[PDB]
């Protein structure tokens, strides 16, 4: 099926392996995975951080006709499992000096979710984007501001972690996928650009 020519050993990730709006495996709920882990399931993970890096490598990305990407769901490769890659990076300063920390999140989450989160909401001021989306779609996508999730790693290993920001964001909008939700969903229906008291807009 799909997963076995994603786990090849040779095999990269690129485009042409994420689906596209419209595919139904985009809307259904993924399944949970059971642990320990298959090592189909271990090294689709694994593949899935390759491409985040990849895509976010200026000659990878060219190489390989990448769009710079921050995170990915299992179900954009057309494999409805709860397991999503999320690679955040910092940013250098205007000296040019390197980050202290190269990424403020780099993780492969199994079963993640929300357990809890704030009553403030948030959106990035520049919309969201979708690999799986070839359209402009503009407007806030409306999502909660800082979030509790808990998720497993490969190892099985449960983590508890408290996340604001654009780290948030991200985890949010990848754990959308994996229970058949769309980033536009999200953004109101007659106004795009309409916000709600209170809303913190992320620059
Ligand atoms: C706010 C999260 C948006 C993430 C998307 C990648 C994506 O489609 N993830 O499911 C991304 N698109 C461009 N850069 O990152
Ligand atoms: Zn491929
Ligand atoms: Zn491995
Ligand atoms: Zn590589
Ligand atoms: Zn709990
Ligand atoms: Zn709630
Ligand atoms: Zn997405
Ligand atoms: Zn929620
Ligand atoms: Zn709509």
Known sequence: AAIDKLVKASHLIDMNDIIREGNPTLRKVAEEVTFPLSEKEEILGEKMM????????????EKLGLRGGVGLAAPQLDISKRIIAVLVPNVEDAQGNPPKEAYSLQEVMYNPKVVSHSVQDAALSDGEGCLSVDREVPGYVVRHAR????????????????????????????????????????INEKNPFAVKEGLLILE
């Open 147 to 186: 979030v509790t999730i808990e998720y497993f790693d490969k190892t099985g290993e449960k983590h508890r972690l408290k996340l604001k920001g654009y780290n948030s964001i991200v985890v949010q909008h990848e754990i959308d996928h994996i229970d058949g939700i769309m980033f536009y969903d999200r």
């Open 50 to 61: 390759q491409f985040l890096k990849h895509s976010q490598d200026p000659i990878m990305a």
